[PDB]
Design a protein around this ligand. Structure first.
Ligand code: NAG
Ligand code: CA
Ligand code: CA
Lengths: 145, 145
């Protein structure tokens, strides 16, 4: 885990609260084994909810000088709490289209050369992305480790 | 859940003590709400809650103090039917005992009459006993007495 979200930041759950004041050493395999006040015993409400952001949470965006998100700019991917660029090797038209469709900018797209300004020179997370026909999101396309 | 009021010269005002079947124990102020206090006055036949006083105003309670917290709807006839939520032990101390002042404070009796049900009306207020004036006293007052 990279983050532990509280105060119902992710969303509001309608189900009844099951556990209260969970204390876990962090090495137990199952969530039940951690100590609590008692199963089905609580003093909180629905407004308090617990969210978790795991390590392999991936999001895609384009970085530009004018705006943090844009339809044209550097391609960035998010993994293990860090942003990373993607290499241009083995880049294909279908992969470009899948990237554009995932973020809702257009149907197809094109690859422009590198701009004059780059922000923070963030590292590269993945290279040699090959997208087949069919997957709308980039997570389903094979690549290098 | 048997409640009682102690430490008060006023007939329907005193410190709250709840009996859990066999043992008498005080109640911490943070565990008492307005709804629970209203039920307590109703169960004790005192009518209506006027105020809730913490800090052991009525008298420094002794014995154990229970960490049970009352989650009362407000319309329960007794405290026993009112749902409660347990808490970790040792949360509250003696210096935070709860006190309740209900409505029915007047005390009136009949004295010197040969029949127990018949006699002159005596009312106690401000620490002294006295006889109620006959002026503006009529049958409607007599029936309630
Ligand atoms: C996750 O935790 C990191 C490290 O403390 C912090 O920089 C980041 O803002 C947190 N994210 C959220 C959504 O709370
Ligand atoms: Ca809690
Ligand atoms: Ca914990």
């Amino acid at each position: 885990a990279i983050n532990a979200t509280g105060s119902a930041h992710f969303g509001e759950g309608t189900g009844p609260i099951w556990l209260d004041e969970m204390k876990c050493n962090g090495k137990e395999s199952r969530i039940w084994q951690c100590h609590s006040h008692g199963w089905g015993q609580q003093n909180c409400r629905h407004k308090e909810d617990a969210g978790v952001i795991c390590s392999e949470f991936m999001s895609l965006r384009l970085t530009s000088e004018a705006s943090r998100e844009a339809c044209a700019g550097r391609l960035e991917v998010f993994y293990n709490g860090a942003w990373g660029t993607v290499g241009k090797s083995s880049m294909s038209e279908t992969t470009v289209g899948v990237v554009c469709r995932q973020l809702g900018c257009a149907d197809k797209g094109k690859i422009n050369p590198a701009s004059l300004d780059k922000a923070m020179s963030i590292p590269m997370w993945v290279d040699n992305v090959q997208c087949p026909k069919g997957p709308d999101t980039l997570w389903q396309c094979p690549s290098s480790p | 859940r048997e409640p009682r009021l102690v430490g008060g010269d006023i007939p329907c005002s005193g410190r709250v003590e709840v009996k859990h079947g066999d043992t008498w124990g005080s109640i911490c102020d943070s565990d008492f709400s307005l709804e629970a206090a209203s039920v307590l006055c109703r169960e004790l036949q005192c009518g209506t809650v006027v105020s809730i006083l913490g800090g052991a105003h009525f008298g420094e309670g002794n014995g154990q103090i229970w960490a049970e917290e009352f989650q009362c709807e407000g319309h329960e006839s007794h405290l026993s039917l009112c749902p409660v939520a347990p808490r970790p032990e040792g949360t509250c101390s003696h210096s935070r005992d709860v006190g309740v002042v209900c409505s029915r404070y007047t005390e009136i009796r009949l004295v010197n009459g040969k029949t127990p049900c018949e006699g002159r009306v005596e009312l106690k207020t401000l620490g002294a006993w006295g006889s109620l004036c006959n002026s503006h006293w009529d049958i409607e007052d007599a029936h309630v007495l």
